[PDB]
Each structure stands twice: as structure tokens, then as C-alpha cells.
A paper describes a structure:
Non-hydrolyzing [name]-[name] 2-epimerases catalyzing the reversible conversion of [name]-N-acetylglucosamine ([name]-[name]) and [name]-N-acetylmannosamine ([name]-ManNAc) are central to the biosynthesis of various bacterial cell wall polysaccharides. The [name] [name] enzyme (henceforth abbreviated as PaMnaA) belongs to the [name]-[name] 2-epimerase protein family PF02350; structural data from 12 bacterial species are available in the Protein Data Bank (PDB). Both, monofunctional bacterial and bifunctional mammalian enzymes (vide supra) have similar folds, consisting of two Rossmann-like domains that form an active site in the cleft between them; this structure is characteristic of GT-B fold-type glycosyltransferases (GTs).
Crystallography on recombinant PaMnaA conducted in this study yielded an unliganded structure in 2.2-Å resolution, confirming the predicted catalytic and allosteric site of the enzyme. The crystal structure was solved at a final resolution of 2.20 Å in space group P1211 with two molecules in the asymmetric unit (AU). The PaMnaA structure contains two molecules in the crystallographic asymmetric unit, both displaying nearly identical conformations with an overlap Cα rmsd of 0.32 Å for 370 equivalent residues. The space between these two folds forms an interdomain cleft containing the active site.
Author numbering:
A (entry chain A): 2 to 41, 46 to 65, 70 to 379
B (entry chain B): 2 to 42, 47 to 65, 69 to 379
Write the structure that this text describes.
Amino acid sequence: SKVKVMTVFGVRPEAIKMAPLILELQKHPEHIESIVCVTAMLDQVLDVFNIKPDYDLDIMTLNDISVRVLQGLEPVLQEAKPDIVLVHGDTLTTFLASYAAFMQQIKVGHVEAGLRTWNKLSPFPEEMNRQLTGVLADLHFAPTDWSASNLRKENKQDASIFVTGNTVTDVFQYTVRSDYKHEVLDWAQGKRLVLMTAHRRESQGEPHRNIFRAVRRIADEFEDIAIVYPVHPSPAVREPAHEMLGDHPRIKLIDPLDVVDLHNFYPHTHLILTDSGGLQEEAPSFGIPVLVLRETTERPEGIDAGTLELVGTDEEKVYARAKALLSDETTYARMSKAANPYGDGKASQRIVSAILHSFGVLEERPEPFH
Amino acid sequence: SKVKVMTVFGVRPEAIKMAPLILELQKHPEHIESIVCVTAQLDQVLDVFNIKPDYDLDIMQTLNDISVRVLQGLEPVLQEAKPDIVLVHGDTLTTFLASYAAFMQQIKVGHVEAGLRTWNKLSPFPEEMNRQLTGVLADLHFAPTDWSASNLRKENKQDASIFVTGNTVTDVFQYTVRSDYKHEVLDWAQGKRLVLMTAHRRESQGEPHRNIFRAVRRIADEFEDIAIVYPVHPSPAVREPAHEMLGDHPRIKLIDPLDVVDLHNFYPHTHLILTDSGGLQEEAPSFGIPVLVLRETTERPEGIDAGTLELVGTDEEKVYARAKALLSDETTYARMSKAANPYGDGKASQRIVSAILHSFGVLEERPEPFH
């Protein structure tokens, strides 16, 4: 008999962040039996990573989902009798699965533990979901030292916290290929590829107008850049973007990129302007400095590490900081050299070691991630 | 148009501690509409206090079954009654579920008796995990004591959300104690210092009980002005060694366990207590009665910290010696009797209602905390 590890998730983002961990668990058949339970059509990502769910609950109101996840999971847990349920992040499923496991005295491991706004109403219900999971979790896999210190602020036992980095950083192995080809990359071939995204609804109109004027000026000023802008579908973005950026030789407006396309652009790209939490988390793995089109951010670790800079939404600031990053090779090499404080691409390895250690199979505590 | 407060309780003890708070809520009809929701897996308690449940889920059982049933039951009740705040008590599963049901409808949560911690999810199970889960859903924490509030601050709860109110257990004596009260055993004890002893914990049932019974016997032989009342655990593993070792002594009356209302009515007549009851330890010091605790430790420091309780263990000599001391020298009796019950002053319900009124902006000034 083995450590029976059941991973439970049920949305597209959760699936991608859990896939590399599941693949890591399957590398230890000596010590671990890897069970996968989906709550939920997440089989699209599961076909990429070639993950076969052993259970598929179907939950096609917050109270209704809660009841239905609890009902579905009870028989799954008393049949499989896992030693540890692993949940990810801050979905309703993360909390409900931890709670189903708590009610059968099954150990809980929380992947991406410790993220806090300390505001119940923002985000809702994710802040409450991650605080509830926080009280049910036996093992906290904190991506960062800031995450781990959130957990210490709540009086969690130090020995229960493992800073592992984020598994987001483990997916590039499965996703990035050399074979990879795109018309947009061919169009950008000889130039510094500048990747920009603005999907935040609250920046439509005046803020977008300001960003676009700064970007146009930058396109005009630099003859050795090619700006790729995967534009938000909304007419409230498409129109102003086409109107103000649509007929420039060094700006390609395109349809939003798939995750796999996005990951494959990263090796080719020089600078990012985004308001995406995802690009801010991933891009530094490839040396890409990120200028963040926001007044603030929820996560401090990127700022403090210098992988990201807040640049806001006003024209002068966006232009100036974009200019500075594209000429001043000192600031670029600085942001580019700083290592992704969000992970190594070895988080799944550390989480599996932490599970093995907690069950007495590994006598040594793995080295954290700093 | 008022602050609609729905109070939720599930078990006999939960109902008794919530009863005084409901009766206090009913005293503010200008500001508060009081609603009562029962979620039981009780009709005596609810009659003693004259409380009419407005709602009632007749719950049929794993923790998961209860969990699904309470959630299913409460969604209709909260959708209809549309309360502004849900009040929940202690560390029951139902307290958490009711808090969770409320959270999903963005309904405010008030937690009565918040902040009790062992920081061990395995003792008690599932109560420690239940009160931590409730702790993350509560908007208002009604901490019985400063120690309880300190636990909540250790968990990074915001200071303005914590109110130290005292415990509503000290609010129930007004409703249960009558001057008109009579009892055979009270008459038997008349003219004497009544020593009330209980021994309920299964952990001590054997040679610890024999050690205690021996100490009690030597105290019964020694003291002429003493009457020992022992409402014995009805289990033959206790009732037999008790009736064997103490049942002959004319200064000891072994009787059946007391109703809560009877126990409360003994308190004004009792000089001294020996117990392992967490209940007597919370209650008796409201009547200035010193308690010798028949345990090596207790979960809860506030009693020991105040001089209301002394840990005395189960070893014959120390039970004897500490019992003898409390019966012999005032100055020791006096230190313990005079110290204010750190668990409450009978006004907790009043402080909880003020906290609620203040949180809804009806009372502009933050009310003053218990001691």
C-alpha cells in the first residue's frame, strides 16, 4: 500500500496549475497512488497533459453547489479512502473538498496557500474560501515567503507551512516547444517583440485611451520593436483600439491568445505591458520585464523583487516607463536578471517531497524555495 | 423597519446559553425584530424561558448528512426571513453551518462565545475546527473574556470586530433561580456548610474516584458543621464505589444528578464545590463559591488566573488538604469567594445587543467592554 493522494479541482485555471503536480505525483509509484477527482468540460486541458480523471462529479446558487459538491464527494472519499486530499487556490470547490475531507478525518494539503486581501467583500467569495481552506489544511504549500507570513499572522504552526513556489511556473515544460511557429512571431521576426494585454473591465474608455496614446508614441519612436496586442473582445475595447492603434506598421492587433500560444510567445518577447495577474506571475520565468497598467496590485512579491513595476494608466507615465525599458539597458537587465519570486519550475517536486515527509516516507524536510 | 436578528441553536446546552440573549433582544422592539431558528438532531428548555421558535428544521447521521441537511433547511428560512444578522453560539457543527449559510447570502454573522482555543484540531474534535471555521465567517466576535479576545487577535481578527461581553451563562440565573425554592436535601443541609461535589469525567472513573472518595470521607468524619451533597454519575462504575465508600456516612447525602434549574437553585445555599465539571467552574463563582477542581489541568486559564478556581487533582492527600484549608481558614475562602467571576457579571446579553445596535449604526458610541 502507498500514500493515496487525491487531487480535487474543477475549472480551467485550477486544472492547468494542478496538471504538473499530478504529473509529478505519477513519478513516485513506489510511494504514491495518484487519484484525480474533477467537480466541473475540463477534459480539454486534461487531453493536453494526458490526465485521466478517476472521478468526474458533474455540478452543471453558492448553497446549491455546496450541497452538490458535498453529496458527490462523500461516496468518492469512502470508496477511494485517500490518505490526503490536495486542493488548489481559492474556488468554492477548494473549500468544499477540504471540508468533505475534514468530515472523514482525511489529511488536507492546500496548493497556493496564504494569499490574502483581508477583505471578505473583495474578492468575494475567494478571500473567505482561502481563509476557510486555511483552517482545514494540514499542509500549507505557500508559493512565497509573503504567503507563508500571511499564514503565520493567522497563528498557523510553522512546521505545517512549506514555501514551494507556485505550480504555474511548472507548466512551461509541458506547454513550451521549439517546433512552435506563429504568423505573429514571423511578422515580429527581426524586432524586439513588445507584448501588451488590457482585459480589466474597469479601465475601459479614458484609461485605455491614455495607454493607447502612450503606445502609439512608443510605436512611432522605436523602429526596432513590434507591438503584439491580443485585444479584449468587447466593442468598448476593440473599437477604440482599432481606431487609435489599427493602422501602424509596428502594431499587430490580434484575437486573444490561448494559454499554449501565450506560453510559446514568452521565449520570443522582450517587454510586457499588462494588467493581467497571470502574465505578471509567469513572464519573469523568461527574463521578461513587466510594466503593470494599474495603480495597485493585490500581490507585493513581484514589486519588491523588481520583476514588475506599477506604471498606472496615465499617458505620460506609460510612455516614459516604456521608453526607459526600451532604451536604458541598465533598468532592463535589472528587471530581466531578478528571478521569478513566484517559483523555480520545481514547485511540484517540493510539494510531493512535503507530502512524502509528512507521511514519514522522507525523514528529511525538503529545502523550501528562496 | 428594524435590525432583524435571527438566533440559531441546536442542542439543549446551546439553547440555555442563547435563551437569555433572545429575552434581551425582545426588550428592544423599537430597534430589533427578534427571530428564533431551531436546527436540532429541547421542548423543556424553550418552555422554561417562554421562547417561541419562528422556524425549525426537524433534522433526522454523518457530519456530512447534518451538513447537507442544515444548508438545505436554512436557504429557504434566510431567503424568507431576510435577517440583517445571524447569531450563532459556541463550537457546534450547526454554529459553523448556520454561519456558512448566512455568508453565502451576504448576511452578517455574530458569534456568541467566540475565541476558545486549544490550537489542537484533534482535541477537541470536531469543536476546535468548528469554532475556527465560525471564527473566519463571523463579522462580530462576542468574546467571553480578554483571553478569548487575545486568541482571536493571534488569528489576525480586526480589533473593532471583537467585543468582550462576558459569557451569557452568567445571564441565566435571573430566570432559573427562585427565592421560593425548596428541596429535601437543602432541608437536610439546613444549619450546615453545604459542600456540593460532582465527578462526571469518564477519565477518573476507578482509582482517582477511590482517592477522592477517601479524601471526602476523612473531611466528612472531621467537620461537624458540614453537609456533603454528591449527585452521583448514574453509571454503576461510579454509583457503586460511591454508595460502597460514602453511602453509610450521616454527613454525606448521595442523590441522583440535579436538573440545571435545581443545580442553579442549590448555588445560593452552597459553601464550597469539588468538581471536574467545566459547567460548575463557569457558574458557581457568580455566587462567590470557591471551586476545587478534581483535575491535574483544565482547558481555559481565566478561572485559575482569577482566584475563583484551584486545581487540586485526584490524589487523596491534596484533595483532603485543599478541602480542609478552604473549610478551615477564611482569608483563603475569602480570597476565592470575593474575586469577580472572570466569565461574566450577568450582563453579557445586554453588551451583545449594544454591540449589534452599534454595528448597524443605531448606537453611535462603541459600548464599554466587560471588565
